[PDB]
CSV table of N, CA, C and O in Angstrom, one decimal:
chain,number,residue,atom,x,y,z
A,227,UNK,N,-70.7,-11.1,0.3
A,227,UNK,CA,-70.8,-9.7,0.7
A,227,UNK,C,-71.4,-9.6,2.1
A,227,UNK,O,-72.3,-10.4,2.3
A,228,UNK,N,-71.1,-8.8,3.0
A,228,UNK,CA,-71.9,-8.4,4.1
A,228,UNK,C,-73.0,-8.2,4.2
A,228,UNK,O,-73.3,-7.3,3.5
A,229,UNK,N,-74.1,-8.9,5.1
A,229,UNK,CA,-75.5,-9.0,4.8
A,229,UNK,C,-75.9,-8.4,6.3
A,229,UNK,O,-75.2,-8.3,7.3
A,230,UNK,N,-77.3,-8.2,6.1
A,230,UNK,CA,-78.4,-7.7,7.5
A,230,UNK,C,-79.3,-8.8,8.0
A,230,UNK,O,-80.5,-8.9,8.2
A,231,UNK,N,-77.8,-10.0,8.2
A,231,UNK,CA,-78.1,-11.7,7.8
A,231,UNK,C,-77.8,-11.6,9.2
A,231,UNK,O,-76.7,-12.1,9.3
A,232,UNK,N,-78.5,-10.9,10.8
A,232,UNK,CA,-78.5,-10.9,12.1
A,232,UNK,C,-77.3,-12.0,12.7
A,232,UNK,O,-77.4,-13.0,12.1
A,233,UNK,N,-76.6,-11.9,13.4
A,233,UNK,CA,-75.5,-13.1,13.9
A,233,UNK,C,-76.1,-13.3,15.3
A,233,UNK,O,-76.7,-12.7,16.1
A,234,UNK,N,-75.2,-15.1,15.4
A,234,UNK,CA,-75.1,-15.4,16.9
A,234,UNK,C,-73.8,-16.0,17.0
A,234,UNK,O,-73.1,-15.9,18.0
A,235,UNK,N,-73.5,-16.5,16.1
A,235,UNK,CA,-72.2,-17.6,15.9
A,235,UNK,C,-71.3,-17.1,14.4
A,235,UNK,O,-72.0,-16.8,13.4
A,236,UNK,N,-70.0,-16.9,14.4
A,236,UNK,CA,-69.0,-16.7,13.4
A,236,UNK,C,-69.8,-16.8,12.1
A,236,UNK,O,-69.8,-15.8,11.4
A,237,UNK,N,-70.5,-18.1,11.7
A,237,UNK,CA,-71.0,-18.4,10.9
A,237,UNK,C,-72.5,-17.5,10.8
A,237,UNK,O,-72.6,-16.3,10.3
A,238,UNK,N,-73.6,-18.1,11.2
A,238,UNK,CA,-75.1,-17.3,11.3
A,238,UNK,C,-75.1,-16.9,10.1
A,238,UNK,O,-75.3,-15.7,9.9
A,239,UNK,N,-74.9,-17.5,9.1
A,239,UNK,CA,-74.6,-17.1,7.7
A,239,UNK,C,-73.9,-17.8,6.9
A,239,UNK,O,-73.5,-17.3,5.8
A,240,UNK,N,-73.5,-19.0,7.0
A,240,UNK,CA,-72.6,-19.9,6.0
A,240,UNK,C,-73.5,-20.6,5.4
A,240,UNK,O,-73.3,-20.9,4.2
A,241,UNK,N,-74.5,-21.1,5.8
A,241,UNK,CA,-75.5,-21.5,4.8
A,241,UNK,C,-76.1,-20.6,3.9
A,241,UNK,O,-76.2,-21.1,2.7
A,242,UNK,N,-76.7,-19.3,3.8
A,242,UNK,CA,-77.0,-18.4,3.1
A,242,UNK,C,-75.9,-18.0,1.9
A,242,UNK,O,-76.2,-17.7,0.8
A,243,UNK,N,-74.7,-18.0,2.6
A,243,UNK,CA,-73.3,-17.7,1.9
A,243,UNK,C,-72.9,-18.9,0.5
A,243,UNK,O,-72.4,-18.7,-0.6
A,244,UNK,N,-73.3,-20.1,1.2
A,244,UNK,CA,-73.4,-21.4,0.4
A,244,UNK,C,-74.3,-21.0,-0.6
A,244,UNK,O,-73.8,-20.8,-1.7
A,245,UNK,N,-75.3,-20.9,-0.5
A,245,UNK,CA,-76.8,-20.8,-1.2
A,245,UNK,C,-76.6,-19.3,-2.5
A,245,UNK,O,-77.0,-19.3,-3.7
A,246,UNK,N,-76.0,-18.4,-1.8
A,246,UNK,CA,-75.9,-17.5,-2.3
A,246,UNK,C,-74.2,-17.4,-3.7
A,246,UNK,O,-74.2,-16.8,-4.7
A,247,UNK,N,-73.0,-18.0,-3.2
A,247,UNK,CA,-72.2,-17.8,-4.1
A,247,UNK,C,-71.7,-19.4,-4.4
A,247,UNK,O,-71.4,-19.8,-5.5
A,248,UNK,N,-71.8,-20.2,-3.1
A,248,UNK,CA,-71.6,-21.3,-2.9
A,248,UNK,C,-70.7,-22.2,-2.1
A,248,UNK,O,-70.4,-23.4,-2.3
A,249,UNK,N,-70.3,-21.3,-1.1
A,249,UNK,CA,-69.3,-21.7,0.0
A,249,UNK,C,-69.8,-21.3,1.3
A,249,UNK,O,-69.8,-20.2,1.7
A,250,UNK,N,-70.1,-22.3,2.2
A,250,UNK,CA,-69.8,-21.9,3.4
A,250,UNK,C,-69.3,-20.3,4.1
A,250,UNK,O,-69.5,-20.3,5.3
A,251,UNK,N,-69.0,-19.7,3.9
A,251,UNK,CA,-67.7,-18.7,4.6
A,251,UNK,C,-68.9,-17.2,4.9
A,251,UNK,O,-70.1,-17.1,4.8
A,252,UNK,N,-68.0,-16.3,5.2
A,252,UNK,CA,-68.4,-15.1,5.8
A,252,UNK,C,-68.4,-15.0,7.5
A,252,UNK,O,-68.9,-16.1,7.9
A,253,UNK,N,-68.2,-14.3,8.4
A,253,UNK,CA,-68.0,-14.2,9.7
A,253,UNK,C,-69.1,-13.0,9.8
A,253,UNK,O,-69.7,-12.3,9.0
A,254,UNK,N,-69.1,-13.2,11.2
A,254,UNK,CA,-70.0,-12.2,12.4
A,254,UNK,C,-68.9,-11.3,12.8
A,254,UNK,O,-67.8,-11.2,13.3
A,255,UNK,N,-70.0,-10.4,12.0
A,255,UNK,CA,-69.2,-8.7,11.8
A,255,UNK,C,-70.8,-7.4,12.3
A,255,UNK,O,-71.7,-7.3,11.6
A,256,UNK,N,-70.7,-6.7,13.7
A,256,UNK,CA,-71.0,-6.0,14.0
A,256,UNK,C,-72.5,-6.6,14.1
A,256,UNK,O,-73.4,-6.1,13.5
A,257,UNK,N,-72.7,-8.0,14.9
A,257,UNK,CA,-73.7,-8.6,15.0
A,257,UNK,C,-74.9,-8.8,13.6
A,257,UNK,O,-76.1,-8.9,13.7
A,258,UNK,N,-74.0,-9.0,12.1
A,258,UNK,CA,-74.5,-8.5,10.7
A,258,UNK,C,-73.5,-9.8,10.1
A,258,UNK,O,-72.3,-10.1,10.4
A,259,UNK,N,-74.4,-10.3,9.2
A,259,UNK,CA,-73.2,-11.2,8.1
A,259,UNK,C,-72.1,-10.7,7.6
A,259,UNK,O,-72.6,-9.8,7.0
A,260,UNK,N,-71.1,-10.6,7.3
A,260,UNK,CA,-69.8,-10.1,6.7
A,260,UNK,C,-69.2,-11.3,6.1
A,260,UNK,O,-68.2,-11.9,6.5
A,261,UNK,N,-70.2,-11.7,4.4
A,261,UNK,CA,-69.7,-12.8,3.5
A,261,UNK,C,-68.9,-12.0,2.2
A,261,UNK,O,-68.4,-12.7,1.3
């Protein structure tokens, strides 16, 4: 799901995304996680 997981890179969140459902994935959406 889209998080207030701050971005710098596409990713800035594929470890949390990992951690959280279990996959790598989600993009930099409006400087915010979008998993």
């Amino acid at each position: 799901v889209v998080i207030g997981q701050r971005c710098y890179r596409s990713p800035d969140c594929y470890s949390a995304c990992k951690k959280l459902v279990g996959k790598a994935t989600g993009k930099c959406t409006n400087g915010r996680c979008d998993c």
